[PDB]
Amino acid sequence: AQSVPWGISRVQAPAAHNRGLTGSGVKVAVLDTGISTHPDLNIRGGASFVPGEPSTQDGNGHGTHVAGTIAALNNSIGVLGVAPSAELYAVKVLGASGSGSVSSIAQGLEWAGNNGMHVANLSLGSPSPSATLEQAVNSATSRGVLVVAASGNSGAGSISYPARYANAMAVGATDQNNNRASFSQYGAGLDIVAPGVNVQSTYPGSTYASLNGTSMATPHVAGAAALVKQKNPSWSNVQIRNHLKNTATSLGSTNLYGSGLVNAEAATR
Ligand SMILES: [Ca+2]
Ligand SMILES: [Ca+2]
C-alpha cells in the first residue's frame, strides 16, 4: 500500500497529479549525501564530487530522504513525491557524515548546469558566505538551473548560504498548523516556505523514515518547480520561481514566510 505524507497533501501535489502533472520530462538534481537504490525511487544518473566516495549511493540517509519528497514513485508501495515522474539525478556533494566543502558543492552545481538540469535541490547551508559557492550558483542559473536551497535550522532571523544569494530560491519550513517551525531561519532573501516537520520519505535500507528540517521543506518546492516546468516547458528558472511565489498562500509577514506556503494546485491551474 502507498501512503501520502502530510506535507505532500499540504502543498496540494495530488491536485496537480490529477491534471496529468507529475514532473515528467523535468531533470531534478539532488545535491546532497547521495541517493540510495530504493524500490520507491527511479534514479536516472548523477555524479560524485566527494573524494573517496566515488559511488552516488547514500551513506548517510539525508539525500535519499530529500529525493523521495521530490520524486517517490506513484505506485502501490511506500510514499509519494511532489513530482513522482521527475528525472532524478544523484549529485553527491556531501559525504556519509553529512558534510562536504564549498568546492564539492560548486562542482555539483557546475555539473547540473553542464548536464541539462532544470532544478537543483540544495538541502544544505552554512552561516557564512562563499565566493566559490556564489560563482557556481550564478553559473548554474545562467545555464537555466533553478537553484532551490534550505534557509537553515538555527532559528535565526537571517538565512544561510547559499539560500541567501539572489540566484537561489530560499525555502523555510512550516508545521502542520501553517506556522513557521521554530528552527526555520527567516529574514532577508527568504522566498517561500513548505512543510518541514515530521516529514516521512524514502530512506536507505529500503525503508521509510521521518525527519525535521528546512532540508525537508526545500524538496517540496523543488518538486513543485518540476510540476510547473512540465506544465510550462518554455519557462525559465526565473519564471518558475516567480510563479511559485505569486501563487503561494500568504501565512504572515514576508520576513517570516517570504511569499508563504507553496501551492502546487494554484501554481499549475
Ligand atoms: Ca510509492
Ligand atoms: Ca534568496
Structure, briefly:
This is Subtilisin Savinase. By secondary structure, the chain is α/β, with parallel strands linked by helices.
Notes on the structure:
It contains nine helices and nine strands. The two termini are 29 Å apart. It is globular, with a radius of gyration of 16 Å. The chain has helices at 6-10, 13-18, 62-71, 102-114, 131-142, 214-231, 237-246, 254-257, 264-268, and strands at residues 27-32, 43-48, 87-92, 119-122, 146-150, 168-174, 190-195, 199-203, 207-211. It has a single domain (1-269), classed as Peptidase S8/S53 domain (Rossmann fold). Helices cover 31% and strands 19% of the residues. Helix 4 (102-114) runs parallel beside helix 5 (131-142) and helix 6 (214-231) crosses helix 7 (237-246). The strands form two sheets. Strands 2-3-1-4-5-6-7 form a seven-stranded parallel sheet, with helices on both faces. It has a two-stranded antiparallel ribbon with strand order 8-9. It is α/β, with parallel strands linked by helices. The structure holds calcium ion (CA) (2 copies). One calcium ion (CA) binds at residues 163-166, 168, 170, 189, 191. Its EC number is 3.4.21.62. Ca(2+) 1 binds at residues 2, 40, 73, 75, 77, 79. It is found in: Secreted. Residues 5-268 form the Peptidase S8 domain. This is Subtilisin Savinase.
